[PDB]
Design a protein around this ligand. Structure first.
Ligand SMILES: [Mg+2]
Ligand SMILES: [Mg+2]
Ligand SMILES: [Mg+2]
Ligand SMILES: [Mg+2]
Ligand SMILES: [Mg+2]
Ligand SMILES: [Mg+2]
Ligand SMILES: [Mg+2]
Ligand SMILES: [Mg+2]
Ligand SMILES: [Mg+2]
Ligand SMILES: [Mg+2]
Ligand SMILES: [Mg+2]
Ligand SMILES: [Mg+2]
Ligand SMILES: [Mg+2]
Ligand SMILES: [Mg+2]
Lengths: 91, 140, 45, 166, 148, 275, 59
RNA sequence: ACUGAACUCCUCACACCCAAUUGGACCAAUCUAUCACCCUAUAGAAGAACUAAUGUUAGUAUAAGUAACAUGAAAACAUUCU
C-alpha cells in the first residue's frame, strides 16, 4: 500500500463482515428501544418543578457542612507518653 | 568518603538470585541481569492472563475433541447444556471428557436430546406441548 | 474378537525410521542441557 | 595468590576397617609460573585427562609443543613423589584423573605501534595442575547404541502424564 | 518467578485429614531478649498470650529461651522434620499472635509453588479415556482392508 | 576498608551458610540439640495424637535394648522394649486382619497376609513413625535410627496405647495411621505376585467356573515398535477382564491382574474406606 | 479401569493408525481431517507438549 | 450459535499501572547521644544509595592465540663455505 496502511490519501480498504453488520444492527435495536422509553415522561416539566428542592438543599448542606468542618485532629497525652514504652524492660 | 556504602553486595545478590538459570552473562553480570530479571518479572505478571486464557482454550480443545467423538460439535454441546440448566463449566467438562467418559457420553446424549427438542420445538411453531428436558426450573 | 496369535548417521536414520520421528531428537545435547534437567522431578498420583 | 592445590596432598584419612574396599591413592602436583599461556596448556592438559601415565609420557615425548616437555617434567616428578611420599607401589599403576591449567601472575610490557599510539603486551604465565589416581584408567564411555536410544525414547513415552487436568 | 523457583504437588503429611487430624507443628522456640526494644512485643507476647496459646493446642511444646539476643526469632519445627525460622523483630503483640497462629495452622511442606490446586489419587472412577473407548468393535475383530 | 559492622556481620553469616551448604554436617539427633525437654515432648506426643497414655509406660515404650546395652557400657566408664512391641505387633496384625477380612471378604487369606505384611512392613511403618515424631523420641544406640528398631518402637507405642486405653482406641489408631497408607495404592503394588494367569485359573476353579480363553479384542500398531493390544479374558463367551499391553503377553498377564482385582473386590472403583 | 499404572498410561497415549480413502475427495477437506488426527486434536488427552498425535494413511 | 479483554459478574483481598511537575508514607548503610550486646531501638546528623555522563582509576575479557615479529649453511662448534 502507498504508506502507513490506515491513515492518508491511499488507505488500504477494510470491509464490513456479517459480524460487524449484526453488531451494528443489535446496537441500533437497543437504541430504538431507548427511543421508545424516552417518549413517555411520568410528569410534565411544570409538574416536576421543585419536587426535590428540599432534598437537594439538604444534600448541599451536607457537602457544605463537610467542607466547613475540616481542622487539625486532637492531640492526646497518652500517645506522647505511650512512646516511652520503647524502652520497656523486664526484671 | 564519610559514609560510603557497605551493604552493596547484598543488593547485587538481591537481583542476581533470580538470574541463576539464565544463559550468557545474564546469570553473572549485574548490568545485564537487572534488565533480564526486570523483564522476566514483567513476563511473569503478564502471563497470568495468558495462563487463564490458554487453560480455557485448551479446555475448549478437549471438549471439542471428545464431543466430536460422540458426533456433536462444541457449540451444540455447550449451548444445549446451558439450555438444560446444567451449568457445568469448561474445566469440569474437560475433566469428565478425560476421566469419566460415560458421564460425558450421557451429557452428550442430554445435550443432543435437548438440541433435537429445540429443532422439533422451533419446527412445529405455535402452541404445542413442550419438551420433557426442555422444561425450565423457575426459582423465586 | 480375534484369537491370540501363536555409525551415528545410519543409527539415527534407523531410529527415525523405527519410531517415525525426525532425526533431530536423537542427536545429543551438551552439558548445559544435561545439567539443567531436574533429575528428581515431583511424582504425583 | 591462592595455593590450595599443594595442600591437597596433606589430607590424612582415618585408618580403614576390615570390611571396606581399598582406597585408591590420589596425588596432587602442580607447577607454578610456567612461561606459556593458559590456553595453549589447555590442549596438552586436555590430551592426557584420562590416559595412564605411561601412555601420557609416550604422548608428550613426541609432541612438538613447548608445554609438552614441561608437563612431562610434572608427570615424572609426580610419579617420583607418587612412589616415595604417597605409598603407590607400582609406577605404572597411575592414571591422570585431573590435568588442568589456570593462569599465573602475568606481566605487562609496552608494544610499540606505528605512530605515537601503542599497546600493552602481557608476558603470559600459567600454572599446571595434576591429580594422579592409583589404579587402572577408567574405560572410555561407550557411545550409546540404538538399544539405549530406543529405551530412552520409550522411557520418555512411558513417563508422560495427562497434563492440565486431574 | 516460577521457572527459577522449584515446584511441588499439593499433598499432606500422612494423609492428614482421613482418619484424624494431627497438628503438624511440634515445637515453637522463642528467643526473647530481656532488655531490648527489638523483643518488646515478644516480651508482651510472653506475658500475655503465649500461655493461652500454649493451652489452646497442647500438642505443641514451646521453648521460650530468654537470652540476650539482638534480633528475636521464633523457630517452628514440624512433624516431618521441617524447620521454619521466622523473625519477630519489632512486631507488635497482635502481629505475633497472627504470625504464631499462622505457623500453627500450616504444615511442614515447602512454601514453593504448588502445581495443581487439587490432588486426587483416584482421579478416574468410570475408567480413564483410551482411544478405544468410544470406538465400536467390528465383527471378527477385522481392521480396514482386511478380507478374512 | 569501609567502616561499619553490619555488612561484615551479615556477610559473615552468609559465609557461614555457604560453609554449611558446601560441607553439610552429619545429622545429630534431636535430643543432642538445644530446646529439648524429653518429658514435655512425650506428653506432647500423647496430646498430639488425641489419646491418653500412662506416661511412664510410654517412657518404657520408647526405650530400646541397644540403648540399654550402650548405656550400661557408658556406665562402666530400665525395662526394655520387646514386650510392648510384642503386644503391639500381635494386636496390630490381628486388627489389620479384622479390618481387611471385614472390608474385603472376597480376598484370599494369602493376599490378606501379604497386605498386612505391607502395612506392617518396614517401609510403611518407618514412613509413618518418622512423621509422627516417634524417631525423635526413640532412645536408641545409633543415629539415624535403623528401620527394625523404629518399627519395634512403633509397635511399642501401639501396645502401650493398648495397655493405656484398651483395644478399641488402638483399633482406631491403626485405622487412622496404618490403614490410610494403602489409599491410592494398587493391590499388586502391595501384594506383589508372579504369574497372575495361573493364580487366576485357580481362583476360577474355586468358583467352579470353566477355564478362560485369552482373546484379542482390540489392537493397534501390530508391526511397529509401539504396539497396543487389549487382551480380553472370556469365560464361556463372557468376559471377566480386558487389559492393554505393549505386547500380547503383557496384555494377557495384565488382564489376568484386572480379573484378579475384580474377583477380590479390590477394584479401582470399590467403596472407599469408611472413617 | 482397574489397570496398573504403566498399562493404563500406555493405553491412554498409544497412537492409532487411521486409514482414509481419498477417491473423488477434495484435498483440503481431507487435509482438515488428516491434520486433526496428526496433531492429536481428536483426543481429549490432547496437549501440544504430550506428543499425542497419531498416524494417518491416505490412500 | 460459538469463540473472544485487564469491561462486568464470581471467592477472598484492596492505598498498590501515566511524562514534566507536585503531595505523602516509609527507609539501606555510616557517625553521634543513650539503650542494646550474634547486630539492635528512639532520636540527632550527613561526602547518606549508580543497569547509563565517547565518565575516571584499576582488573580481566572480545577481536585472538589473530595481525605482526625473528636465526645464511654444514661441522670438531677449532673451522670452512655461500
Ligand atoms: Mg505504508
Ligand atoms: Mg592482553
Ligand atoms: Mg472468557
Ligand atoms: Mg476493572
Ligand atoms: Mg480494588
Ligand atoms: Mg537511624
Ligand atoms: Mg554522594
Ligand atoms: Mg558499580
Ligand atoms: Mg539511569
Ligand atoms: Mg560509567
Ligand atoms: Mg586468547
Ligand atoms: Mg602461530
Ligand atoms: Mg580473524
Ligand atoms: Mg602472518
Amino acid at each position: 500500500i502507498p504508506g502507513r496502511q490506515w491513515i492518508g490519501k491511499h488507505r488500504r480498504p477494510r470491509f464490513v463482515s456479517l459480524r460487524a453488520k449484526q453488531n451494528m444492527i443489535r446496537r441500533l435495536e437497543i437504541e430504538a428501544e431507548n427511543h421508545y422509553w424516552l417518549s413517555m415522561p411520568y410528569m410534565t416539566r411544570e409538574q416536576e418543578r421543585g419536587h426535590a428542592a428540599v432534598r437537594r438543599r439538604e444534600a448541599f448542606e451536607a457537602i457544605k457542612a463537610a467542607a466547613t468542618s475540616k481542622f487539625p485532629p486532637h492531640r492526646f497525652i497518652a500517645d506522647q507518653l505511650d512512646h516511652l514504652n520503647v524502652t520497656k524492660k523486664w526484671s | 568518603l564519610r559514609n560510603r556504602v557497605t551493604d552493596r553486595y547484598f543488593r547485587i545478590q538481591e537481583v542476581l538470585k533470580h538470574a541463576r538459570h539464565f544463559r550468557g552473562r545474564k546469570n553473572r553480570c549485574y548490568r545485564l541481569a537487572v534488565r533480564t530479571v526486570i523483564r522476566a518479572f514483567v513476563k511473569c505478571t503478564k502471563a497470568r492472563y495468558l495462563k487463564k486464557k490458554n487453560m480455557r482454550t485448551l479446555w475448549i480443545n478437549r471438549i471439542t475433541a471428545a464431543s466430536q467423538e460422540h458426533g456433536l460439535k462444541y457449540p451444540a454441546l455447550i449451548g444445549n447444556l446451558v439450555k438444560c440448566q446444567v451449568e457445568l463449566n469448561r474445566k469440569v467438562l474437560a475433566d469428565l471428557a478425560i476421566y469419566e467418559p460415560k458421564t460425558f457420553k450421557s451429557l452428550a446424549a442430554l445435550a443432543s436430546r435437548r438440541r433435537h427438542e429445540g429443532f422439533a420445538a422451533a419446527l412445529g411453531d405455535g402452541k404445542e406441548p413442550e419438551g420433557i428436558f426442555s422444561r425450565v426450573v423457575q426459582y423465586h | 474378537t480375534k484369537p491370540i496369535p501363536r555409525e551415528e548417521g545410519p543409527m539415527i536414520e534407523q531410529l527415525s525410521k523405527m519410531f517415525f520421528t525426525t532425526k533431530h531428537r536423537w542427536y545429543p545435547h551438551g552439558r548445559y542441557h544435561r545439567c539443567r534437567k531436574n533429575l528428581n522431578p515431583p511424582k504425583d498420583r | 595468590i591462592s595455593r590450595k592445590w599443594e595442600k591437597k596432598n596433606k589430607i590424612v584419612y582415618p585408618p580403614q576397617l576390615p570390611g571396606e574396599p581399598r582406597r585408591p591413592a590420589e596425588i596432587y602436583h602442580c607447577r607454578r609460573q610456567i612461561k606459556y599461556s593458559k590456553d595453549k596448556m589447555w590442549y596438552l592438559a586436555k590430551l592426557i585427562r584420562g590416559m595412564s601415565i605411561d601412555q601420557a609420557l609416550a604422548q608428550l615425548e613426541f609432541n612438538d609443543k613447548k608445554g609438552a616437555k614441561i608437563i612431562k617434567e610434572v608427570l615424572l616428578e609426580a610419579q617420583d613423589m607418587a612412589v616415595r611420599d604417597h605409598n603407590v607401589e607400582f609406577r605404572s599403576n597411575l592414571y591422570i584423573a585431573e590435568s588442568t591449567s589456570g593462569r599465573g601472575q602475568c606481566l605487562k610490557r609496552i608494544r610499540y605501534h606505528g605512530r605515537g599510539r601503542f599497546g600493552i603486551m602481557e608476558k603470559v604465565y600459567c600454572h599446571y595442575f595434576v591429580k594422579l589416581v592409583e589404579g587402572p584408567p577408567p574405560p572410555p564411555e561407550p557411545p550409546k547404541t540404538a538399544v539405549a536410544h530406543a529405551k530412552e525414547y520409550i522411557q520418555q513415552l512411558r513417563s508422560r502424564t495427562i497434563v492440565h487436568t486431574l | 518467578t516460577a521457572r527459577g523457583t522449584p515446584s511441588r504437588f499439593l499433598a499432606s503429611v500422612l494423609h492428614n485429614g482421613l482418619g484424624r487430624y494431627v497438628q503438624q507443628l511440634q515445637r515453637l522456640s522463642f528467643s526473647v531478649s530481656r532488655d531490648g526494644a527489638s523483643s518488646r512485643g515478644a516480651r508482651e507476647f510472653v506475658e500475655r498470650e503465649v500461655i493461652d496459646f500454649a493451652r489452646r493446642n497442647p500438642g505443641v511444646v514451646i521453648y521460650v529461651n530468654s537470652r540476650p539476643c539482638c534480633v528475636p526469632r521464633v523457630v517452628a519445627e514440624y512433624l516431618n522434620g521441617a524447620v521454619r525460622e521466622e523473625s519477630i523483630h519489632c512486631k507488635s503483640v497482635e502481629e505475633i499472635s497472627t504470625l504464631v497462629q499462622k505457623l500453627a495452622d500450616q504444615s511442614g511442606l515447602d512454601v514453593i509453588r504448588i502445581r495443581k490446586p487439587f490432588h486426587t489419587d483416584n482421579p478416574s472412577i468410570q475408567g480413564q479415556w483410551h482411544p478405544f473407548t468410544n470406538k465400536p468393535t467390528t465383527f471378527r475383530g477385522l481392521r480396514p482392508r482386511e478380507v478374512q | 576498608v569501609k567502616k561499619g559492622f553490619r555488612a561484615a556481620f551479615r556477610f559473615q553469616k552468609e559465609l557461614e551458610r555457604q560453609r554449611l551448604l558446601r560441607c553439610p554436617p552429619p545429622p545429630v539427633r534431636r535430643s543432642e540439640k538445644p530446646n529439648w525437654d524429653y518429658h514435655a515432648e512425650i506428653q506432647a506426643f500423647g496430646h498430639r495424637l488425641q489419646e491418653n497414655f500412662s506416661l511412664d509406660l510410654l517412657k518404657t515404650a520408647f526405650v530400646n535394648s541397644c540403648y540399654i546395652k550402650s548405656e550400661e557400657a557408658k556406665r562402666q566408664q530400665l525395662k526394655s522394649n520387646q514386650e510392648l512391641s510384642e503386644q503391639g505387633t500381635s494386636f496390630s496384625q490381628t486388627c489389620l486382619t479384622q479390618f481387611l477380612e471385614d472390608e474385603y471378604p472376597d480376598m484370599p487369606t494369602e493376599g490378606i497376609k501379604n497386605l498386612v505384611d505391607f502395612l506392617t512392613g518396614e517401609e510403611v511403618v518407618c514412613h509413618v513413625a518418622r512423621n509422627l515424631a516417634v524417631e525423635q523420641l526413640t532412645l536408641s544406640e545409633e543415629f539415624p535410627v535403623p528401620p527394625a528398631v523404629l518399627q519395634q518402637t512403633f509397635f511399642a507405642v501401639i501396645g502401650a496405647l493398648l495397655q493405656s486405653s484398651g483395644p478399641e482406641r488402638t483399633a482406631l489408631f491403626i485405622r487412622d495411621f496404618l490403614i490410610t497408607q494403602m489409599t491410592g495404592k494398587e493391590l499388586f503394588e502391595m501384594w506383589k505376585i508372579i504369574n497372575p494367569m495361573g493364580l487366576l485359573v485357580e481362583e476360577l476353579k474355586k468358583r467352579n467356573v470353566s477355564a478362560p480363553e485369552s482373546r484379542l479384542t482390540r489392537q493397534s500398531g501390530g508391526t511397529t515398535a509401539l504396539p497396543l493390544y487389549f487382551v480380553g479374558l472370556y469365560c464361556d463367551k463372557k468376559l471377566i477382564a480386558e487389559g492393554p499391553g505393549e505386547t500380547v503377553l503383557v496384555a494377557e498377564e495384565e488382564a489376568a491382574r484386572v480379573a484378579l482385582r475384580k474377583l477380590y473386590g479390590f477394584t479401582e472403583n470399590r467403596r472407599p474406606w469408611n472413617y | 479401569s482397574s489397570f496398573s499404572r504403566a498399562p493404563q498410561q500406555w493405553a491412554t497415549f498409544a497412537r492409532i493408525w487411521y486409514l482414509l480413502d481419498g477417491k473423488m475427495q477434495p484435498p483440503g477437506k481431507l487435509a482438515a481431517m488428516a491434520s486433526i488426527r496428526l496433531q492429536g486434536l481428536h483426543k481429549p488427552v490432547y496437549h501440544a507438549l504430550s506428543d499425542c498425535g497419531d498416524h494417518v494413511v491416505i490412500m
